[PDB]
């Protein structure tokens, strides 16, 4: 298989995470950066196997990380993950990493910003307003009414949410309004492209800048998807937009610079082919592999 | 002991409430209406013992009720009124108003539209409950993480347990002055609000906030002489609280709003003995055989 190696890591509680470090190709530029991407409401798009394959052909390291389990998601669960795979690459030795993040687990990003030691931050329709973000996904907002009348479960695909376990959370850790990410960003030093879709009904493109005015250092950009919505898996076109976009940004940002008209590799469609039947190689693999304590 | 009965209901989940019954002065005229109070954080206020008496001099049947218990959550307060309410209903008892003030008069506001009471009377009543809580403690704790919280919080003299109640607060919403003002639009109970005039926990311009909601629009807004939250801060504040509210109750038994009204005030002697009576009633509620509610 390409060698993408699966990864069990075991949090001293009961929880096993999984993630799958793909390594740069043999013969392109050094690049100083390793990259994490939160793949866990990655479904509808294959966990990003084509992403870390753009990266990787383009000398990224890259380890894509899923959700901590007990063998239902809350956002603190999210942020508990990435905390751990992080805390795991520092122990390997790891020093500079870059994240990228899209939808609900750039909401997770947002908010340990200003506590990790990261050499930028890429996000892609990211979430700044979660209870307003719910609601034009669900129909309803669900946050008003008393937990006790929540409908068993909600359905926000990319997986199924458990709800009084997640809306408990929701406002016992304040991921609710756009003020508790406002809060987050502020004190940033983290360098951040942001790239908002198009035709996204579903984050405001306003509460989007209204964030990125609030990172104190000015050291941010703003960048859009064309014609996509908030599924960036619509169609083949909107995929490799998304996909060259956050490679070229995270080409740039890697040399320190947030202009991301800069050249690139692009993989073909077989190449992008091996790494999805190589995925389901993987899943088997980690079947049965060695946690590592965390 | 003056007549006061002591009564204990136990709800069908294990949890005990206490409620003091003072019937009508003998020879006063009739009144309509039962008087419930929630005098359950009125440790401070004698548990309305003085208020009781004034009421009942005055011809009102009163029942005084605290909170369920087997710590105290807004929603163990709206149980509690729902608790007693239901149980002077099976007594066939019928036409009710109800007296609340302070943090009560917030569970009182909850459930406005779907009691049929005869009218609501509130003394520096919260509308607003993360800035009551704010001002009265010092520092907002709503806006920490449910684990960074604090054992406890003392909240004007009774200390509550901080996860438990901030859970509910947010889980329930009793959080801001949208909620209430929900719970308050539809109404239509009549209500007197009465004010203190320098209240720094209770804001009155939401209070004049929530009664322009209201849309009935039969509702008003009377302030206390001084006062600032505290209604027992001496003897003259204290029995304008008293008076205010049996002029008010006097006044919405038959169906009126304006306060100019005559009443029969209790003098020092018969006060004294509801507080002494008080201590006997807390004593036998032990050998009192609990009621189902």
Redesign the interface.
Known sequence: QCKTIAHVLRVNNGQELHVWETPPKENVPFKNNTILIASGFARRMDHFAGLAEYLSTNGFHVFRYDSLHHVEFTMTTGKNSLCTVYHWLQTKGTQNIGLIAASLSARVAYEVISDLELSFLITAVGVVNLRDTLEKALGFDYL?L??DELPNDLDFEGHKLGSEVFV?DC????WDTLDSTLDKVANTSVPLIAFTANNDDWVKQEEVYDMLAHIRTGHCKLYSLLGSSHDLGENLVVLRNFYQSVTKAAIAMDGGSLEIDVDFIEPDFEQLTIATVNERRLKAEIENRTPEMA
């Open positions: 008003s008393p937990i408990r406002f016992e850790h304040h």
